[PDB]
Subunit: 152 residues, 3 copies
C-alpha cells in the first residue's frame, strides 16, 4: 500500500536528518550522541515493523525515551511558552529533526487507526518528538545560548 511506503520513507527521512544532526557534534563522548544513535537503530526497527496482522513492536524504547526526557527536564528551567527554534547548530538541527519526526507520526497514525501497525509505533514517535524538543533545549543550555521567546 502507498500509505505504508509513505510511513517508511518518512521514518527513513527522520533517521537521515538525525544522522546529519549527529555529524554536528564536535567533541566525542557526549552521552546524547549515544542516545541519538540508539534512536536511529530503533527507527530502523519501526521501519521494519511498518512492513507487514501487524508485527509486535517492543515497548522498551518508549520507557527509555521517557527516562531520558525526565533526565534532561531535571536540569532545565521551567518553560511555559513557545520558543523560537534556535540555540546552536545542534539545537537547530534537532528542532528540524523534531518537526520531521512529527510528520512521521502523522504518516503513521492512519496505519495505527486501521490496525496495520502496532500502536506502540505511533506512541514511540510521539514521545520521540518530546525527547527531541527537550534535548534541543538542553543543548542550547549547555552552550549558554539565549533561547528566544516571542509573545504578543
Amino acid at each position: 500500500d502507498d500509505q505504508v511506503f509513505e510511513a517508511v520513507g518518512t521514518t527513513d527521512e527522520l533517521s537521515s536528518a538525525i544522522g546529519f544532526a549527529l555529524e554536528l557534534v564536535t567533541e566525542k563522548g557526549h552521552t546524547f550522541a549515544e542516545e541519538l544513535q540508539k534512536i536511529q537503530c530503533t527507527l530502523q526497527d519501526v521501519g521494519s515493523a511498518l512492513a507487514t496482522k501487524y508485527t509486535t513492536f517492543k515497548a522498551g524504547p518508549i520507557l527509555e525515551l521517557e527516562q531520558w526526557i525526565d533526565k534532561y527536564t531535571s536540569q532545565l528551567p521551567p518553560l511555559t511558552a513557545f520558543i523560537l527554534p534556535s540555540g546552536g547548530k545542534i539545537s537547530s538541527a534537532l528542532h528540524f529533526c523534531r518537526a520531521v519526526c512529527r510528520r512521521a507520526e502523522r504518516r503513521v497514525v492512519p496505519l495505527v487507526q486501521m490496525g496495520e501497525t502496532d500502536a506502540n509505533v505511533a506512541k514511540f514517535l510521539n514521545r520521540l518528538s518530546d525527547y527531541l524538543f527537550t534535548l534541543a533545549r538542553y543543548a542550547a543550555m549547555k552552550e549558554g545560548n539565549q533561547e528566544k521567546i516571542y509573545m504578543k
Copy 2:
C-alpha cells in the same frame, strides 16, 4: 487521546487532519529557517533580524491555523483575523534587496554559499507549507492572508538567497539544458 489531539477551539481530531499537517509544516518551515539562521557566522546582519521576525510571524500563523473559523468564538477573534501588515513588510524587504541585485535573466540552480543554499531549502519548505495551507483557506477555515503571506515569503527567501550569494561574492550556478 493517542492518535488524536485538539485544536485551540476544542475540536478533537485525528492527528492526520489537514490542520495538523498545516501547522506541522509551518513548524518545519520555522525550524528550517532556524538552522539557516544559525549559519550566519558574522553578527549584526539585518536579515538575521528579518528571518527572526518571520519566525515570529510563523508562530502567529500557527495560532491562526489552529483556530478554525467554523468554531471560533468571540475571544478567538484576534487569531482568526490575520492582519496583512507582515505581508507588506515582506514586499518592502524584497524591494530593498532587488535594488541591490543585478537583473535576473536565467534560471538559477540552488547554490551560492551555505546561507544561500539553506535559504533555497527554506523556500522549498515554505512552498510545501503553502500547499498544505491552501486547502484550509479555500474551505473558509483560515484567513486568506495566511496563504498570501506564505506566497510572498517564497519570493522573499529567493531574493534573500541571491543577496547572500552576492555579499559573499559567490556566483550562482545557472540552469543549462542537456
Copy 3:
C-alpha cells in the same frame, strides 16, 4: 516586481495554461522535486576541496531535476486537451546515472548490513537527499499511474536514489569514516 500576486488566492498555472489549486498532485510533485534539488544544492557546499567529479555530477543532476519539474508540470491529458506536443522525457540521464552508479559501486567494499545514515557531513547529507528523493518518487508515481507524466521521470527518480546511496558510501569511504551498522 518579481511577484505577481496571481497566487494569492490559492491557484496557480501548469505549463499548459491550465489553472489548478496549489494543492494539486502536479504541484506536489513539482515542489518535492524542487526540494530535492535544493537539498542536493546544500550538500554540494559541504565539499571541503575543489574539483571533485561527484560535485560536477550533482550539479548536473540538479539541471536534470529542473527538466523533471518542467515535465511534471505538463500533464499529458491537458496536452491533448490543449493540442500541445507530447512532452517526452529522454532516457539519457538514467543511463548516465547507471554508469556513475557502476563506477562507485565497483570501488567500495560490499555490504551485507543495514547501515545507519552517517559517515561524515557529505555522507549524511547525501542520505538526507536520498530520503527526500524517495519522497519525490512517491509523489510522481501516482502521476504515471494516471497517465499524466512519462514513466521515465519516475524511473530517473528511482535510480537517483540508488546513485545518492552509493555516492554516500563512496564519500564515507574516501573520508575514512565508517558507516555505523546495527
